[PDB]
């Protein structure tokens, strides 16, 4: 976390800083998107 890294989450690859999210996804939800439909939040496969 808190470091600019290349990440791969269940085939979603991206470069960014991963921070602890206050977003509370519904249990079926896996990703999050902005008004522009860019990936905003992700769910860790290992731990929810």
């Amino acid at each position: 976390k808190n470091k600019c890294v290349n990440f791969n989450f269940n085939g979603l690859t991206g470069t960014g800083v991963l921070t602890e999210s206050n977003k509370k996804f519904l249990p079926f939800q896996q990703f999050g998107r902005d008004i522009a439909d860019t990936t905003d939040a992700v769910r860790d496969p290992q731990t929810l």
């Binding site: 690859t13 991206g14 008004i35 522009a36 439909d37 860019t38």
Partner: protein, 226 residues
């Protein structure tokens, strides 16, 4: 009275700005027209333009360079066209904003730093002064102007005969309330006795159309008579 009218007008400006958003609509339009454009630009990153995927990183991960090259070329063409469209619309909008800013600078020069004789350049009525106020990406001019209010009918004449001489108003007009003739300033009813100090002589009675008969007071004559 004039101080109270100015104060009340400033209060009404406050009341208009505190309850009507659409008043600053123009500035908001600019803030909208840019943002919409930006949104559109970013939305074009989500388009395929004929490629297998809009995501560039999902092409390189799934294809060999010889095959990924065609899809990346499609994406490049589409995104380049989108960016060119954005830049062209922004150049035209910048020309519009530069025209508006030149008008605002001219209004600051001729309207705040001076008194403008240009009609409606500085709002309804006869311009007295203007006050600038900063606004988000713009300027707001409070134009203080003079509007004539309570009108009254009078009989009028272009000139007056005294002793075969035609008298014309030095400034103002000859007005009759119905029995007596005065000379007043044109923008405010302040009737005055028609004297040789109020008027000037030019030729005789025959030439002028609509000339009327009256007496022209000579301020010297009572003093000289004594």
């Amino acid at each position: 009275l004039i101080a109270n009218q100015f104060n009340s007008a400033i209060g009404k400006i406050q009341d208009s700005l505190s309850s009507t958003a659409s008043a600053l609509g123009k500035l908001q339009d600019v803030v909208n027209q840019n943002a919409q454009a930006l949104n559109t630009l970013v939305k074009q990153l989500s388009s395929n333009f004929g490629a297998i995927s809009s995501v560039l990183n999902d092409i390189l991960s799934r294809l060999d360079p010889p095959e990924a090259e065609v899809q990346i070329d499609r994406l490049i063409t589409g995104r380049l066209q989108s960016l060119q469209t954005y830049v062209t619309q922004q150049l035209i909008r910048a020309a519009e904003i530069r025209a508006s800013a030149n008008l605002a600078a001219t209004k600051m020069s001729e309207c705040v730093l001076g008194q403008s004789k240009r009609v409606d350049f500085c709002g309804k009525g006869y311009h007295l002064m203007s006050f600038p106020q900063s606004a988000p990406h713009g300027v707001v001019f409070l134009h203080v102007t003079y509007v004539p209010a309570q009108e009254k009918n009078f009989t009028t004449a272009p000139a007056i005969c005294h002793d075969g001489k035609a008298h014309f108003p030095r400034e103002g007009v000859f007005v009759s309330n119905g029995t007596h003739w005065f000379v007043t300033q044109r923008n405010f009813y302040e009737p005055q006795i028609i004297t040789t100090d109020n008027t000037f002589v030019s030729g005789n009675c025959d030439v002028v159309i609509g000339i009327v008969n009256n007496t022209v007071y000579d301020p010297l004559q009572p003093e000289l008579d004594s």
